[PDB]
Scaffold this active site. Structure first.
Site, mmCIF file in Angstrom:
data_model
loop_
_atom_site.group_PDB
_atom_site.id
_atom_site.type_symbol
_atom_site.label_atom_id
_atom_site.label_comp_id
_atom_site.label_asym_id
_atom_site.label_seq_id
_atom_site.Cartn_x
_atom_site.Cartn_y
_atom_site.Cartn_z
ATOM 1 N N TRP A 147 -4.355 -1.388 -4.519
ATOM 2 C CA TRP A 147 -5.782 -1.519 -4.433
ATOM 3 C C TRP A 147 -6.266 -0.192 -4.859
ATOM 4 O O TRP A 147 -5.643 0.902 -4.945
ATOM 5 C CB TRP A 147 -6.211 -1.644 -2.976
ATOM 6 C CG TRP A 147 -5.518 -3.011 -2.220
ATOM 7 C CD1 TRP A 147 -4.525 -2.617 -1.318
ATOM 8 C CD2 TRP A 147 -5.654 -4.085 -2.546
ATOM 9 N NE1 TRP A 147 -4.026 -3.944 -0.906
ATOM 10 C CE2 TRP A 147 -4.585 -4.795 -1.803
ATOM 11 C CE3 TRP A 147 -6.241 -5.129 -3.361
ATOM 12 C CZ2 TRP A 147 -4.255 -6.475 -1.782
ATOM 13 C CZ3 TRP A 147 -6.088 -6.369 -3.516
ATOM 14 C CH2 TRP A 147 -5.073 -6.968 -2.528
ATOM 15 N N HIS A 183 -9.112 0.097 -0.302
ATOM 16 C CA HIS A 183 -8.470 0.891 0.499
ATOM 17 C C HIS A 183 -9.181 1.355 1.667
ATOM 18 O O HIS A 183 -8.832 1.614 2.906
ATOM 19 C CB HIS A 183 -7.824 2.310 0.015
ATOM 20 C CG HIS A 183 -6.556 2.213 -0.491
ATOM 21 N ND1 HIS A 183 -5.530 1.930 0.037
ATOM 22 C CD2 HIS A 183 -6.202 1.916 -2.064
ATOM 23 C CE1 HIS A 183 -4.495 1.734 -0.685
ATOM 24 N NE2 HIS A 183 -4.893 1.731 -1.945
ATOM 25 N N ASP A 191 -4.316 8.985 -4.015
ATOM 26 C CA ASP A 191 -4.278 8.385 -5.293
ATOM 27 C C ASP A 191 -4.830 9.736 -6.144
ATOM 28 O O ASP A 191 -4.469 9.947 -7.187
ATOM 29 C CB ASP A 191 -5.398 7.335 -5.647
ATOM 30 C CG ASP A 191 -4.704 6.048 -5.304
ATOM 31 O OD1 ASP A 191 -3.409 6.064 -5.322
ATOM 32 O OD2 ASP A 191 -5.193 5.151 -5.536
ATOM 33 N N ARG A 224 -1.890 12.243 -6.695
ATOM 34 C CA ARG A 224 -0.931 12.267 -7.657
ATOM 35 C C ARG A 224 -1.557 12.401 -9.124
ATOM 36 O O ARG A 224 -0.771 12.644 -9.873
ATOM 37 C CB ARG A 224 -0.492 10.609 -7.582
ATOM 38 C CG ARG A 224 -1.454 9.693 -7.971
ATOM 39 C CD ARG A 224 -0.860 8.344 -8.302
ATOM 40 N NE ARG A 224 -2.028 7.447 -8.795
ATOM 41 C CZ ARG A 224 -1.971 6.305 -8.501
ATOM 42 N NH1 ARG A 224 -1.114 5.589 -7.804
ATOM 43 N NH2 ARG A 224 -3.214 5.557 -8.656
ATOM 44 N N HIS A 226 3.897 4.896 -4.347
ATOM 45 C CA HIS A 226 3.060 3.783 -4.274
ATOM 46 C C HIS A 226 3.248 2.606 -4.436
ATOM 47 O O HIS A 226 2.500 1.375 -3.974
ATOM 48 C CB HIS A 226 1.753 4.013 -4.993
ATOM 49 C CG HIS A 226 1.174 5.597 -4.863
ATOM 50 N ND1 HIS A 226 -0.175 5.445 -4.547
ATOM 51 C CD2 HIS A 226 1.567 6.747 -5.012
ATOM 52 C CE1 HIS A 226 -0.334 6.863 -4.583
ATOM 53 N NE2 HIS A 226 0.554 7.540 -4.896
ATOM 54 N N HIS A 277 -2.801 5.145 3.546
ATOM 55 C CA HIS A 277 -2.922 4.643 2.121
ATOM 56 C C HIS A 277 -1.783 3.650 1.718
ATOM 57 O O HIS A 277 -2.069 2.612 1.045
ATOM 58 C CB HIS A 277 -2.674 5.916 1.126
ATOM 59 C CG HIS A 277 -2.799 5.437 -0.363
ATOM 60 N ND1 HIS A 277 -4.193 5.406 -0.876
ATOM 61 C CD2 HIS A 277 -2.196 5.017 -1.460
ATOM 62 C CE1 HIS A 277 -4.029 4.869 -2.178
ATOM 63 N NE2 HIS A 277 -2.985 4.683 -2.489
ATOM 64 N N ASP A 279 -1.619 -0.278 0.212
ATOM 65 C CA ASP A 279 -0.843 -0.445 -1.231
ATOM 66 C C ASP A 279 0.397 -1.702 -0.953
ATOM 67 O O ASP A 279 0.238 -2.400 -1.845
ATOM 68 C CB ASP A 279 -0.346 0.728 -1.767
ATOM 69 C CG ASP A 279 -1.039 1.546 -2.791
ATOM 70 O OD1 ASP A 279 -2.331 0.932 -3.128
ATOM 71 O OD2 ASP A 279 -0.494 2.623 -3.384
ATOM 72 N N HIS A 305 2.340 -4.653 -6.430
ATOM 73 C CA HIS A 305 2.673 -3.169 -6.010
ATOM 74 C C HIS A 305 4.248 -3.364 -5.381
ATOM 75 O O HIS A 305 4.822 -2.332 -4.977
ATOM 76 C CB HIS A 305 2.130 -2.633 -4.705
ATOM 77 C CG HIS A 305 0.881 -1.620 -5.475
ATOM 78 N ND1 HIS A 305 0.943 -0.327 -5.254
ATOM 79 C CD2 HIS A 305 -0.188 -1.931 -6.154
ATOM 80 C CE1 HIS A 305 -0.154 0.220 -5.689
ATOM 81 N NE2 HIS A 305 -0.642 -0.846 -6.231
ATOM 82 N N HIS A 318 -2.862 -6.010 -13.458
ATOM 83 C CA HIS A 318 -2.848 -4.998 -12.284
ATOM 84 C C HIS A 318 -4.224 -4.486 -11.939
ATOM 85 O O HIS A 318 -4.465 -4.331 -10.439
ATOM 86 C CB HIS A 318 -1.828 -3.709 -12.568
ATOM 87 C CG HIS A 318 -1.600 -2.890 -11.401
ATOM 88 N ND1 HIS A 318 -0.159 -3.057 -10.945
ATOM 89 C CD2 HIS A 318 -2.355 -2.070 -10.715
ATOM 90 C CE1 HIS A 318 -0.234 -2.369 -9.761
ATOM 91 N NE2 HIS A 318 -1.581 -1.930 -9.640
ATOM 92 N N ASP A 350 -6.178 -4.801 -8.394
ATOM 93 C CA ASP A 350 -6.525 -3.581 -7.523
ATOM 94 C C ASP A 350 -7.978 -3.282 -7.491
ATOM 95 O O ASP A 350 -8.611 -3.230 -6.297
ATOM 96 C CB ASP A 350 -5.974 -2.340 -8.469
ATOM 97 C CG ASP A 350 -4.747 -1.961 -7.910
ATOM 98 O OD1 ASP A 350 -4.067 -2.447 -7.165
ATOM 99 O OD2 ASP A 350 -4.437 -0.932 -8.462
#
Ligand SMILES: *[C@@H]1O[C@H](CO)[C@@H](O[C@@H]2O[C@H](CO)[C@@H](O)[C@H](O)[C@H]2NC(C)=O)[C@H](O)[C@H]1NC(C)=O
Ligand SMILES: *[C@@H]1O[C@H](CO)[C@@H](O)[C@H](O)[C@H]1NC(C)=O
Ligand SMILES: *[C@@H]1O[C@H](CO)[C@@H](O)[C@H](O)[C@H]1NC(C)=O
Ligand SMILES: [Zn+2]
Ligand SMILES: [Zn+2]
Ligand SMILES: [Zn+2]
Ligand SMILES: [Zn+2]
Length: 264
Positions: free
Chosen positions: A1, A6, A45, A48, A60, A116, A120, A126, A149, A153
């Protein structure tokens, strides 16, 4: 997401954590705010995107090596891989938040990661290898050129709610909570966490992964990808999946609340 998803999962969790658990998490996070969990739901997120955080990208998701839409299945040892996956990350950090030898900010990092990743894991793409978790499936949604995707998300959830501010996530969580406590999900809710045990994080997380992975075959791409790259996905495809998106956001929130309660 994406962001809205989230924050929503987090607000739903905030509602179901015991008062005692909510004070331990607030102490650990150093924030007693009304958005104590929601405000940091997307931190992983952002992390990363840094050189320091690049190593964590693989946590993730779990690239299930199955054969949609014919056969959907998850296998921990077959699919997790050498650099870790969402399942191994749940085990790593469940153990680290409650480790007494670690530092305070090691605990804060672990909690932020758990908030998180538990969310996910409920996004079906995912938990699937195909076309790089659907990123390679180029499609048209509402006139725009997206990929499968990003539609799951971000774009479909925002189409439903209308924005991604914390206030939008707060209102979405409100309707979801109503449904779990006094509505359409009431009868289902207990099944979302049935069997979850912090002393068995791999078995538990594999269960969450299998539950989401099954939807790839029945809801995400039930008739193959070619069927999705040919018209606009709105409103026909959208209509057939939006109920599943709400259901998955609600499961993430409810599971996160119970996980925190067990840890505390
Ligand atoms: C468990 O969590 C720790 C803490 O995030 C991970 O440690 C990081 O590991 C990467 C890659 O080895 C390093 O570049 C980071 O500097 C480490 N950070 C810290 C604070 O130790 C650890 O790798 C995780 N282990 C598993 C199996 O996922
Ligand atoms: C998907 O990718 C290729 C390259 O853009 C394109 O030729 C094909 O028509 C694409 N599908 C759509 C819906 O663009
Ligand atoms: C969790 O796991 C242990 C077994 O290792 C068990 O004693 C405990 O009752 C389990 N169930 C729950 C619901 O905690
Ligand atoms: Zn996400
Ligand atoms: Zn994603
Ligand atoms: Zn993520
Ligand atoms: Zn309530």
């Amino acid at each position: 997401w994406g962001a809205l998803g989230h924050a929503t999962v987090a607000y739903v969790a905030q509602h179901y954590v015991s008062p005692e658990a909510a004070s331990w998490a607030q102490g650990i996070l150093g924030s007693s705010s009304s958005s104590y969990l929601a405000s940091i739901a997307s931190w992983a997120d952002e992390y990363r995107l840094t050189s320091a955080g690049k190593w964590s990208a693989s946590l993730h998701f779990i690239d299930a090596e199955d054969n949609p839409p014919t056969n959907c299945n998850v296998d921990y040892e077959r699919d997790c891989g050498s650099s870790g996956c969402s399942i191994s990350a749940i085990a790593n950090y469940t153990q680290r938040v409650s480790d007494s030898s670690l530092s305070s900010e090691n605990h804060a990092e672990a909690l932020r990661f758990l908030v998180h990743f538990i969310g996910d894991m409920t996004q079906p793409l995912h938990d699937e290898a195909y076309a790089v978790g659907g990123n390679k499936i180029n499609v048209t949604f509402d006139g725009y050129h997206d990929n499968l995707h990003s539609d799951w998300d971000t774009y479909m959830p925002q189409k439903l709610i209308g924005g991604h501010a914390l206030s939008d996530a707060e209102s979405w969580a409100k309707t979801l909570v109503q449904n779990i406590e006094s509505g359409n999900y009431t009868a289902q809710a207990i099944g979302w966490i049935k069997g979850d045990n912090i002393s068995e994080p791999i078995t538990t997380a594999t269960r969450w992964a299998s539950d989401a992975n099954a939807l790839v075959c029945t809801v995400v791409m039930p008739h193959g990808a070619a069927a999705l790259q040919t018209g606009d996905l709105y409103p026909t495809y959208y209509d057939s999946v939006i109920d599943t998106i709400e259901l998955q956001i609600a499961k993430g929130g409810y599971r996160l609340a119970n996980w925190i309660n067990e840890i505390h």
